[PDB]
């Protein structure tokens, strides 16, 4: 339930091939950016960084949970379906 990992903007790159090392079976890669993940305060900072470095990018708008209406009393409604059968 913690939300502390959803505060900042990230920049990652497209995933590329990983294959099995013949000797050990370890995951090998030829992608030097496979682990590169950058952090930004705002999407404008992230876009600016991407533009000056020549990378083409996709921007996904931040999803924020919408305000919910909560009422403990609704659990015991006289004539509404919200009444709970167990506690």
- Give the H or E element holding residue 51: helix 43-52
Which residue, 21 or 86, has its beta carbon nearer to other proteins?
A: 86
Residue closer to other proteins by CB (options 7, 81) is 81
Stretch touching other proteins by CB under 8 A, among 14-22, 34-42, 49-57, 70-78:
70-78
- Region label for 25, one of left (φ > 0), alpha (ψ between -120 and 50) or beta (otherwise): left
Q: Is 70 an interacting residue with respect to other proteins (CB under 8 A)? A: no
E strand map for 3-58:
9-11, 18-20, 27-29, 38-40
User: C-beta of 2: minimal distance to other proteins in Å?
Assistant: 19
Taking alpha carbons only, the member of 62, 85, 72 closest to residue 9 is 62
| 62 vs 87, beta carbon nearer other proteins | 87
Residue numbers at the binding site for other proteins (CB under 8 A): 72-73, 76-79, 83, 85-87
């Amino acid at each position: 339930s913690g939300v502390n990992n959803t505060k900042k903007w990230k920049m990652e790159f497209d995933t590329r091939e990983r294959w099995e090392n013949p000797l050990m079976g370890w995951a090998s890669t030829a992608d030097p950016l496979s682990n590169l993940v950058l952090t930004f305060s705002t999407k404008e900072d992230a876009v600016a960084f991407a533009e000056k470095n020549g990378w083409s990018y996709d921007v996904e708008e931040r999803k924020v949970p919408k305000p919910k209406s909560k009422s403990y009393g609704a659990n015991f409604s006289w004539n509404k379906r919200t009444r709970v059968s167990t506690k």
